């Protein structure tokens, strides 16, 4: 139940959650992911999804 993206942030292999949270922000991953080539494709199926009469 996992599907792998192209992003690899950097933290130690035995890090706690605050080090992981610190590294998402420095990578600018939220701004990169929502404009990534087919996270766009995600939200068009989400738009197409169930679609009022």
């Amino acid at each position: 139940n996992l599907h792998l993206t192209k992003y690899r942030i950097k933290f130690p292999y035995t890090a706690p959650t605050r080090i992981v949270r610190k590294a998402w922000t420095e990578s600018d991953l939220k701004a990169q992911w929502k404009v990534s080539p087919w996270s766009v494709k995600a939200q068009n199926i989400c738009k197409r999804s169930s679609l009022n009469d």
Binding site: N1, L2, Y13
Partner: protein
């Protein structure tokens, strides 16, 4: 089921000739606490006298792994009954909880040695560090930085479409 651990304590209920019997305790792995109070009695009948009816069960309480997201190697000292066969083993598993490694051992013995579970006595269960493990299928994972490309998914059956129009395609790029 999933086999969480308990501490079952037992006495030998003290007829007045003897005051304050010596109180032995355990580490029982069991699906539920009704079956942990016949694993206490099975294991103690090897060790001290006092069966039930002639003993008591003082506090059986569940123990809740003390670091559920730390990642550690569990060595299990076992002994089982094969078809010709009482043996000892020392198996090593890699998990987060200690009831989850014991239950990863009760399947493995069933797979690899056919070991239906009434044959398995567990001696000890530890959290050995690393460079004390031996068990090459556990030492695979004792190296940062580990890579392995994946090939593993779900492939619904029939699907959200049984007669598909577009071919699942195990690969891309």
């Amino acid at each position: 089921g999933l086999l969480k651990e308990y501490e079952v304590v037992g006495r030998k209920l003290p007829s007045e000739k003897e005051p304050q019997t010596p109180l032995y305790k355990m580490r029982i792995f069991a699906p539920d606490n009704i079956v942990a109070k016949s694993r206490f009695w099975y294991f103690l009948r090897q060790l001290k006298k006092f069966k039930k009816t002639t003993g008591e069960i003082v506090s059986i309480k569940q123990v809740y792994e003390t670091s559920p997201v730390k990642i550690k190697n569990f060595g299990i000292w076992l002994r089982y009954d094969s078809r010709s066969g009482t043996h000892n083993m020392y198996r090593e598993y890699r998990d987060l909880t200690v009831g989850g490694a014991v239950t990863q051992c009760y399947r493995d013995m069933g797979a690899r040695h056919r070991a239906r579970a009434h044959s398995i006595q567990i001696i000890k269960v530890d959290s050995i560090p690393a460079a004390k493990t031996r068990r090459v299928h556990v030492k695979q994972f004792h190296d940062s930085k580990i890579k392995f490309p994946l090939v593993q998914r779900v492939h619904h059956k029939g699907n959200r479409k049984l007669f598909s129009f577009r071919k699942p395609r195990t690969y891309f790029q």
